[PDB]
Design a protein around this ligand. Structure first.
Ligand SMILES: CCCCCCCCCCCCCCCCCC(=O)OC[C@H](COP(=O)([O-])OCC(O)COP(=O)([O-])OC[C@@H](COC(=O)CCCCCCCCCCCCCCCCC)OC(=O)CCCCCCCCCCCCCCCCC)OC(=O)CCCCCCCCCCCCCCCCC
Ligand SMILES: CCCCCCCCCCCCCCCCCC(=O)OC[C@H](COP(=O)([O-])OCC(O)COP(=O)([O-])OC[C@@H](COC(=O)CCCCCCCCCCCCCCCCC)OC(=O)CCCCCCCCCCCCCCCCC)OC(=O)CCCCCCCCCCCCCCCCC
Ligand SMILES: CC(C)=CCC/C(C)=C/CC/C(C)=C\CC/C(C)=C/CC/C(C)=C/CC/C(C)=C/CC/C(C)=C/CC/C(C)=C/CC/C(C)=C/CC1=C(C)C(=O)c2ccccc2C1=O
Ligand SMILES: CC(C)=CCC/C(C)=C/CC/C(C)=C\CC/C(C)=C/CC/C(C)=C/CC/C(C)=C/CC/C(C)=C/CC/C(C)=C/CC/C(C)=C/CC1=C(C)C(=O)c2ccccc2C1=O
Ligand SMILES: CC(C)=CCC/C(C)=C/CC/C(C)=C\CC/C(C)=C/CC/C(C)=C/CC/C(C)=C/CC/C(C)=C\CC/C(C)=C/CC/C(C)=C/CC1=C(C)C(=O)c2ccccc2C1=O
Ligand SMILES: CCCCCCCCCCCCCCCC(=O)O[C@H](COC(=O)CCCCCCC[C@@H](C)CCCCCCCCC)COP(=O)(O)O[C@H]1[C@H](O)[C@H](O)[C@H](O)[C@@H](O)[C@@H]1O
Ligand SMILES: CCCCCCCCCCCCCCCC(=O)O[C@H](COC(=O)CCCCCCC[C@@H](C)CCCCCCCCC)COP(=O)(O)O[C@H]1[C@H](O)[C@H](O)[C@H](O)[C@@H](O)[C@@H]1O
Ligand SMILES: CCCCCCCCCCCCCCCC(=O)O[C@H](COC(=O)CCCCCCC[C@@H](C)CCCCCCCCC)COP(=O)(O)O[C@H]1[C@H](O)[C@H](O)[C@H](O)[C@@H](O)[C@@H]1O
Ligand code: HEM
Ligand code: HEM
Lengths: 223, 39, 535, 53
C-alpha cells in the first residue's frame, strides 16, 4: 500500500534524517547507509528499539521500542521500497510471524546455535563481552521474529547469517532452541546466571562460605 | 619480542587461479578392467 | 541390659586390647574454642562430603571419548555426537533418582572445600600459625591446597562439557605445550596423542577418583596427626601461656560441637546443592573443538591462573629457530607463587629471625608487615580472580572489555602496593586503637563536669585505677581487648521469661544470680590459674 | 622409575600422519593438509544435522 509507504516516510522524516540523510543515504561519520538492509533489518532494529538512538558510542544498546507494530511495517516497507533486501517472515494473516518461526527440532538448533554463534553470547543465550565496549546482549527478552531478523541482518558486529549461509529451516531451528533455552527453567536450583563458574563462586562465598564462617563463629567463641 | 614472519605488503596478490583439482592416487589400489561376469 | 551390656562389652574391649591409656590421652586432649580454629575443619568436613558424594558419582560415571549419540531423555541433545563421559554425566543428571542433586552437592562441596582451604590458609597465615614447630604442617597443607586445586580442575573437566573442555584446551594443553624444552613431550605424555587424545578423560578419572585423592587423604591424615599430637596453637589471653592449651576437652564438648559443625556444614552444602544450580552440563554442550562459550572461565580456585593468562601482556621470545610462547610465563608464574606459598615460613624465618618455638599465636594486627604482605597476596588473588570473570564483568557491569583487562593488567602491579600501604598502616592503627584503650579506659556516654562546662567521655578503665581520673595503664598481652562496655557486664540482663511471657520473679532472681556467680567463678578460676603461673 | 614413566613417554615428532610430502608429525599437520598432491579440500560448513550429511 502506497499510504503505508507514506506513513513510513512521515515517521522517517521526523526521527532519523539527522543520521540517514532523508534519501536513505548515510550521513558520513554520523550514521551509516540504510538501503539494501531492508524490512527485516528495520523490524529488528526498531522492534527491539535500538536504532531510534541517541548517541554513537561503543555500541547502541537495547531500549524500549520507539514505534509499534502498526508502524514498523510502514517503516520497513519504506526502507525496502527505497532499497531492498531481506524481509521479515509473515504468516497467513499478513502480520509479522512470531509463533510459526519455532522449528520442529531443538537439538539441531542446540548444536547449530552452539557452533555458529554461542561463542559470542553464551550457551543458553545470556550475554557475552565483546572487544571495545561493545557486548553481546541477553537473548531472554527476544521476540522470535526479532531473533530471526537478528541473525538474518546482523546489526552491529555480528555477522549477517544470511538466507544462504543458514537456511530458513536452520534459522527456525535456532530460534526454536533459544526460545526454549532462555525460557526453560534451570533444572535443579536457582540459575546463577547461565554461565557457570563465576556466579557459582561468588554465591559460594557470600551465600555458602559466609554462612559457614557465621556458623563457625556462633559455635566457637572468640578470645 | 615480535615474531619474525610477518608484516610484508607486496602488491596484494593475483586472484587465485581456478582449482583444476588433480585426480586421486589414494583410491588407486585397483585397476578398472573390462568388467567382472561369468560367461 | 543397656548399661550392664555396655559395661560387659567395655570390659571385653579392655580385655582384648589395652586401649584405655591411649584413649584417655585422646579424650582429655584440649582444643581451644576460638572460632577461627573451626575454619580448617570446613576443609575437612566438606572433603568427607566429597567422598560420600563422590564414591556415589563413581558408580554411574563412564569416562570415554568414544563418540555416542545420546538417544536418552534430554531433548536439546538428541542425535548429537558426544563423548561417553558427557553422556553418562547427562545420565547422572537426568536418569538416576536424586542424581543431579548428588552431583551438584558434590560440586558445591568441592567449592566449599577449595574455598575453605583458602580461608583457613588466611587464618593460619595472618594469625601466624606456621612458624617454627608447625612449618612442615604449613608445607603439607600448602601441597594439599595444590592437589586440591589440580584435582578439582581434573574434576569439572571430567565430563567434557565444552565450557571445561575449552578449559582443558586453555590450561592443560596450551600451557603444557607452552613450556620451552620438555613441553611438547610432557603434553604428549599426559594425553597420549593430540588434545582430544582418547585416553585423557580416563586418565583424569584415574587421577581424580584415587590417585590425587589418595595423596590428599594421606596428607589430611598426616596433617591432622600433626595438628593432633603436636598440640594445637592458640591466641594468647588470660590464662594462656606459651606451654599450655586452654579450652574444652574432646569428649564432653569438642566432639559434640565438631560433629554438629560437620552436620551444619553438610546442611549448608545440601541447601545450596538443592536450591542453586551448578555446572549445568546439559545447558553446556559436548566438547567439540570448534565451538566455545563467551565466559570460558574456570572454577574460581583456578580463576587466578588463567586470569593470569588474561593479564600477562603477550610477551613471547624467539630464540634461534624456536619459540617461547606466553604460556611459559604462567607456567613459571604458577611455579613461582607456589614456591612462595610452600616455602614462606622459611622465607620469613630468614628475614625476621624467628628462631624460637612459638605456640601462642600473634593477632594479625600485631604483625603489620606480615599482615600487609598477606593482604598483598589476598588482593592480588582477588585481582587475578576479579579479572578472570573479565568477560562477564565487562558484560554486566558495563565496562569496555579492553578497559577492564587493562584495569587488571595495571592492578596486579599497583593494587598490591596500594593494599600494602593500607594494610601496613591499617594494622598499625588497629594496634594504636587498642593501645589507647589501655592508657585510657573504654568509652561510654558523656557526663559534663559539674562546676564548669566541660565534656569528658567517661572512660571505664580495664585494670586497677588510681585515686584520680586516670587508671594504672595496663601492658599489652596479645589479647583482643574489649572496646565496648556493651561487651562487658553492662546492661546484659534482659527478662529471662520467654519471648512473649515472663517467668516469676524469684525464678529470674535465681537464674541471674546463678549465671552471674558462674561467670564470676569462671573468671575467678582463670585468674587464679593465671596467678598460679606467675607467683 | 623409567618403567613407570616409559609407558607414558611418546615421541611427538614420530611421523604419524600421511601428508603430501610424506609422513609428517602431528603438530605440522591439520586436516587441511593435502594427502598426495593438490586434492579438492572443500571448505564445507557443519549444518548441525544429527548424523545424515
Ligand atoms: C628528586 C626526587 C625525585 C622527584 C620526586 C618529586 C618531588 C615531590 C613531588 C610530589 C610527588 C607527587 C605525589 C604527591 C602525593 C603525596 C601526598 C601525600 O601522600 O600526603 C602526605 C601524607 C603521607 O605522608 P608522606 O609525606 O608521604 O611520608 C610518610 C612516610 O615518610 C613514607 O611512608 P613509608 O615509609 O611507610 O612508605 C610506604 C611505601 C613506600 O613509599 C613509596 O616509595 C611508594 C611505593 C609505591 C606506591 C604505590 C601507591 C601506594 C601509596 C598510597 C596511595 C593510596 C591511593 O611502601 C608501600 O606501602 C608500597 C610498597 C610497594 C611494594 C612493591 C610492589 C610489588 C607488587 C607485587 C608485584 C607483582 C607483579 C607481577 C604479578 C605476578 C604475580 C606472580 O598523607 C597523609 O598523611 C594523609 C593523606 C590524606 C589524603 C588527602 C588527598 C586527597 C584524597 C582524596 C580521596
Ligand atoms: C568488608 C569486610 C567486613 C569484615 C568485618 C570484620 C569486623 C570485625 O572483625 O569486628 C570485630 C568485632 C568484635 O570485636 P570487638 O569486641 O569490637 O573488639 C575486639 C578488639 O579488641 C578490637 O578490634 P577492632 O574492633 O577495633 O577492629 C577490628 C576490625 C576492624 O575492621 C573494620 O573496621 C571493618 C570495616 C572495613 C571497611 C572496608 C574498607 C573500605 C575502604 C573504602 C574504599 C572502597 C572502594 O576488624 C579487622 O581488623 C578486619 C576487617 C577487614 C576489612 C578488610 C576488607 C576491606 C575490603 C575493601 C572492599 C572494597 O565485631 C564483630 O564481631 C563483627 C562481626 C560481623 C562480621 C560481618 C559483618 C559485615 C557484613 C557485610 C557488610 C557488607 C559490606 C559489603 C562488602 C562488599 C564490598 C563491595
Ligand atoms: C548421598 C547423599 C545425598 C550425599 C552425601 C552426603 C552425606 C552422606 C551426608 C551425611 C554425612 C554424615 C553421615 C552425617 C553425620 C552428622 C552427625 C554426626 C550429626 C551430629 C550430631 C551430634 C549429636 C553427633 C555427636 C558426635 C558423637 C557423640 C561423637 C563422634 C565424633 C565425631 C562425629 C567427630 O566429628 C569427632 C571429631 C574429633 C574428635 C572426636 C569426634 C567424635 O568422637
Ligand atoms: C636460600 C634460603 C635463604 C631459603 C629462602 C629462599 C627460598 C625459599 C627461595 C625459593 C625458590 C624461588 C622462589 C624460585 C623457585 C621457583 C622456580 C622457578 C620453580 C618453577 C617451576 C618451573 C621452572 C617449571 C614449570 C612447570 C610448571 C610449574 C608446571 C607445568 C603445568 C602443568 C604440568 C599443568 O598440568 C598445568 C595445568 C594448568 C595450568 C598450568 C599448568 C602448568 O603450568
Ligand atoms: C594469606 C596469603 C595468601 C599469604 C600467602 C603467602 C604469599 C606470600 C604467597 C605468595 C602469593 C602471591 C605472590 C600471589 C597471590 C596468588 C594467590 C595467593 C593464589 C593462592 C590461592 C590462595 C592462597 C588464595 C588466598 C586466600 C583467600 C583469598 C582468602 C579469602 C579472603 C578472606 C580472608 C576470607 C574471608 C572471606 C569470606 C568471609 C567471604 C567474604 C566475601 C568476599 C566478597 C569474597 C571475595 C571473593 C573471593 C575471595 C573469591 O575467590 C571469589 C571467586 C569467584 C567469585 C567471587 C569471589 C569473591 O567475591
Ligand atoms: C521454597 C520451596 C522450594 C522452591 C525451590 C526454590 C529454589 C529456586 C529454584 C526454583 C525455580 C526458580 C528459578 C527460575 C529459573 C532461573 O534460572 O532463575 C532466573 C534468574 O534470573 C534472575 O536473576 C532474576 C531473579 C531475581 C531474584 C533474586 C536473585 C537471587 C539472588 C539472591 C542470588 C544471590 C547470588 C549472590 C549475589 C552475589 C553478591 C554480590 C555482592 C529467574 O528466572 P526469570 O527471572 O523468570 O527469567 C530468566 C531471567 O532471569 C534471565 O535473565 C534470562 O536470561 C533467562 O534465564 C530467564 O529464564
Ligand atoms: C570493587 C570496586 C572496584 C572499583 C575499581 C574502579 C576502577 C578504577 C578506575 C578505572 C578507570 C577505567 C578507565 C577506562 C576507560 C577506557 O575505556 O579506556 C580504555 C582503557 O583504559 C584503561 O583501562 C586504563 C585505566 C586503568 C585503571 C588503572 C587501575 C587502577 C587499579 C588500582 C584499579 C583496580 C581495581 C580492581 C578491583 C578488584 C578488587 C580488589 C580488592 C581504552 O580502551 P578501549 O576503550 O577499549 O579502546 C578505545 C576505543 O574504545 C575508543 O573508541 C577509541 O577512541 C580509542 O580510545 C581506543 O583506544
Ligand atoms: C614424574 C617423574 C618425571 C621424570 C621425567 C624424566 C624421566 C624420563 C624417563 C623416560 C625415558 C624414556 C622412556 C622410554 C620412552 C622412549 O623410548 O622414548 C622414545 C623417544 O623419546 C626420547 O627418546 C626422549 C626421552 C626424554 C624424556 C622426555 C620426557 C620427560 C618428561 C618431562 C615428560 C613428562 C612425563 C611425566 C608427566 C606426565 C604426567 C602423567 C600423569 C619414545 O619414542 P616412541 O616412538 O614414541 O615410542 C613410544 C613408546 O615409548 C611408548 O611407551 C608407547 O606408548 C608408544 O606410544 C611408542 O610410540
Ligand atoms: C584440605 C586442606 C586442609 C585440611 C583438611 C585442613 C585441616 C586442618 C584442621 C582440621 C586443622 C585444625 C583446626 C584449626 O586449627 O583450625 C588445621 C590446622 C592447621 N592447618 Fe589446615 N587444613 C587444610 C588446609 C591447610 C593449608 C592450605 C595449610 C597451609 C594448612 C596448615 C595448617 C596448620 C599449620 C595448622 C595448625 C594451625 C592451627 O592449629 O590453627 N592447612 N588444618
Ligand atoms: C579431593 C577432593 C575432591 C574435589 C575437590 C573434587 C572435585 C570434583 C568436581 C568439581 C567435580 C565436578 C562435578 C560436576 O560439576 O559434575 C567432580 C566430579 C567427580 N568426582 Fe570429585 N572431587 C574430589 C574427590 C573425589 C573423590 C574422593 C571421588 C571418588 C571416590 C570423586 C568422584 C568424582 C567423580 C567420579 C566425578 C565425575 C562425575 C561427574 O562430574 O558428574 N571425587 N569432583
Amino acid at each position: 500500500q502506497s499510504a503505508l509507504l507514506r506513513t513510513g516516510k512521515q515517521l522517517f522524516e521526523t526521527s532519523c534524517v539527522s543520521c540517514h540523510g532523508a534519501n536513505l543515504q548515510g550521513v558520513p561519520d554520523r550514521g551509516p547507509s540504510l538501503i539494501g538492509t531492508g524490512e527485516a533489518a528495520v523490524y529488528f532494529q526498531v522492534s527491539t528499539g535500538r536504532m531510534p538512538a541517541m548517541r554513537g558510542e561503543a555500541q547502541a544498546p537495547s531500549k524500549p521500542p520507539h514505534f509499534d507494530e502498526s508502524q514498523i511495517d510502514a517503516l520497513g516497507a519504506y526502507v525496502q521500497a527505497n532499497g531492498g533486501g531481506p524481509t521479515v517472515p509473515r504468516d497467513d494473516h499478513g502480520a509479522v510471524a512470531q509463533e510459526s518461526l519455532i522449528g520442529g527440532d531443538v537439538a539441531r538448533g542446540g548444536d547449530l546455535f552452539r557452533l555458529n554463534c554461542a561463542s559470542c553470547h553464551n550457551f543458553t543465550g545470556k550475554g557475552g563481552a565483546l572487544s571495545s565496549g561493545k557486548y553481546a546482549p541477553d537473548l531472554g527478552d527476544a521476540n522470535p521474529a526479532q531473533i530471526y531478523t537478528a541473525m538474518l541482518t546482523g546489526p552491529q558486529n555480528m555477522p549477517k547469517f544470511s538466507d544462504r549461509q543458514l537456511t530458513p529451516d536452520e534459522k527456525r531451528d535456532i530460534v526454536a532452541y533459544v526460545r526454549e533455552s532462555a525460557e526453560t527453567p534451570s533444572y535443579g536450583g536457582y540459575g546463577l546466571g547461565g554461565f557457570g563458574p563465576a556466579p557459582e563462586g561468588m554465591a559460594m562465598w557470600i551465600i555458602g562460605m559466609v554462612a559457614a564462617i557465621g556458623v563457625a563463629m556462633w559455635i566457637g567463641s572468640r578470645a | 619480542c615480535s615474531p619474525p614472519g610477518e608484516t610484508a605488503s607486496s602488491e596484494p596478490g593475483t586472484t587465485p587461479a581456478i582449482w583444476t583439482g588433480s585426480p586421486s592416487p589414494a583410491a588407486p589400489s585397483g585397476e578398472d578392467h573390462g568388467g567382472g561376469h561369468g560367461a | 541390659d543397656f548399661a550392664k551390656l555396655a559395661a560387659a562389652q567395655g570390659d571385653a574391649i579392655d580385655s582384648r586390647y589395652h586401649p584405655s591409656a591411649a584413649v584417655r590421652r585422646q579424650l582429655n586432649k584440649v582444643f581451644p574454642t576460638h572460632w577461627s580454629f573451626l575454619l580448617g575443619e570446613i576443609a575437612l568436613y566438606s572433603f568427607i562430603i566429597l567422598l560420600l558424594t563422590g564414591v556415589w558419582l563413581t558408580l554411574f560415571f563412564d569416562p570415554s571419548m568414544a563418540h555416542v549419540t545420546y538417544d536418552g531423555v534430554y531433548q536439546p541433545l538428541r542425535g548429537v555426537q558426544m563423548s561417553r563421559a558427557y553422556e553418562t554425566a547427562l545420565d547422572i543428571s537426568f536418569e538416576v533418582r536424586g542424581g543431579l542433586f548428588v552431583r551438584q552437592v558434590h560440586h558445591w562441596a568441592a567449592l566449599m572445600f577449595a574455598a575453605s582451604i583458602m580461608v583457613h590458609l588466611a587464618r593460619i597465615f595472618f594469625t601466624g600459625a606456621f612458624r617454627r614447630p608447625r612449618e612442615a604442617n604449613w608445607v603439607i597443607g600448602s601441597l594439599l591446597l595444590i592437589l586440591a586445586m589440580f584435582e578439582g580442575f581434573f574434576g569439572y573437566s571430567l565430563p567434557d562439557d565444552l565450557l571445561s573442555g575449552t578449559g582443558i584446551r586453555a590450561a592443560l594443553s596450551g600451557i603444557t605445550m607452552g613450556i620451552p624444552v620438555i613441553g611438547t613431550w610432557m603434553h604428549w605424555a599426559l594425553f597420549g596423542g593430540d588434545f582430544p587424545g582418547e585416553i585423557l578423560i580416563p586418565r583424569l578419572y584415574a587421577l581424580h577418583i584415587l590417585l590425587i585423592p589418595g595423596i590428599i587423604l594421606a596428607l589430611i591424615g598426616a596433617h591432622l596427626a600433626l595438628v593432633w599430637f603436636q598440640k594445637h596453637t592458640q591466641f594468647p589471653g588470660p590464662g594462656r601461656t606459651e606451654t599450655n592449651v586452654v579450652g574444652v576437652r574432646v569428649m564432653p564438648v569438642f566432639a559434640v560441637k565438631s560433629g554438629a559443625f560437620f552436620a551444619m556444614i553438610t546442611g549448608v552444602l545440601g541447601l545450596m546443592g538443592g536450591l542453586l544450580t551448578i555446572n549445568p552440563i546439559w545447558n553446556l554442550g559436548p566438547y567439540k573443538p570448534s565451538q566455545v562459550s563467551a565466559g570460558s572461565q574456570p572454577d574460581f580456585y583456578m580463576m587466578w591462573t588463567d586470569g593470569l593468562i588474561r593479564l600477562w601482556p603477550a610477551w613471547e621470545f624467539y630464540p634461534f629457530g624456536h619459540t617461547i610462547p606466553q604460556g611459559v610465563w604462567v607456567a613459571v608464574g604458577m611455579g613461582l607463587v607456589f614456591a612462595l606459598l610452600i616455602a614462606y615460613p622459611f622465607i620469613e624465618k630468614k628475614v625476621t629471625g624467628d628462631d624460637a618455638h612459638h605456640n601462642l599465636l600473634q593477632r594479625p594486627r600485631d604483625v603489620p608487615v606480615r599482615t600487609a604482605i598477606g593482604s598483598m597476596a589476598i588482593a592480588l588473588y582477588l585481582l587475578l580472580t576479579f579479572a578472570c570473570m573479565n568477560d562477564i564483568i565487562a558484560l554486566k557491569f558495563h565496562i569496555s572489555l579492553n578497559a577492564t583487562t587493562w584495569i587488571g593488567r595495571i592492578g596486579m602491579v599497583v593494587l598490591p602496593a596500594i593494599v600494602y600501604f593500607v594494610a601496613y598502616r591499617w594494622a598499625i592503627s588497629l594496634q594504636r586503637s587498642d593501645r589507647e584503650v589501655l592508657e585510657h579506659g573504654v568509652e561510654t556516654g558523656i557526663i559534663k563536669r559539674l562546676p564548669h562546662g566541660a565534656y569528658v567521655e567517661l572512660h571505664q578503665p580495664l585494670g586497677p585505677v588510681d585515686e584520680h581520673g586516670h587508671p594504672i595503664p595496663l601492658e599489652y598481652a596479645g589479647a583482643p581487648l574489649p572496646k565496648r562496655m556493651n561487651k562487658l557486664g553492662s546492661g546484659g540482663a534482659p527478662g529471662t521469661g520467654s519471648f512473649l511471657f515472663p517467668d516469676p520473679a524469684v525464678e529470674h532472681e535465681a537464674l541471674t544470680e546463678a549465671a552471674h556467680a558462674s561467670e564470676h567463678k569462671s573468671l575467678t578460676a582463670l585468674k587464679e590459674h593465671q596467678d598460679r603461673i606467675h607467683g | 622409575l623409567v618403567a613407570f614413566i616409559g609407558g607414558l613417554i611418546k615421541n611427538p615428532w614420530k611421523p604419524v600422519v600421511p601428508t603430501a610430502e610424506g609422513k609428517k608429525a602431528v603438530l605440522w599437520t591439520s586436516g587441511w593438509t593435502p594427502r598426495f598432491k593438490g586434492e579438492t579440500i572443500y571448505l564445507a560448513r557443519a549444518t548441525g544435522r544429527p548424523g545424515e550429511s
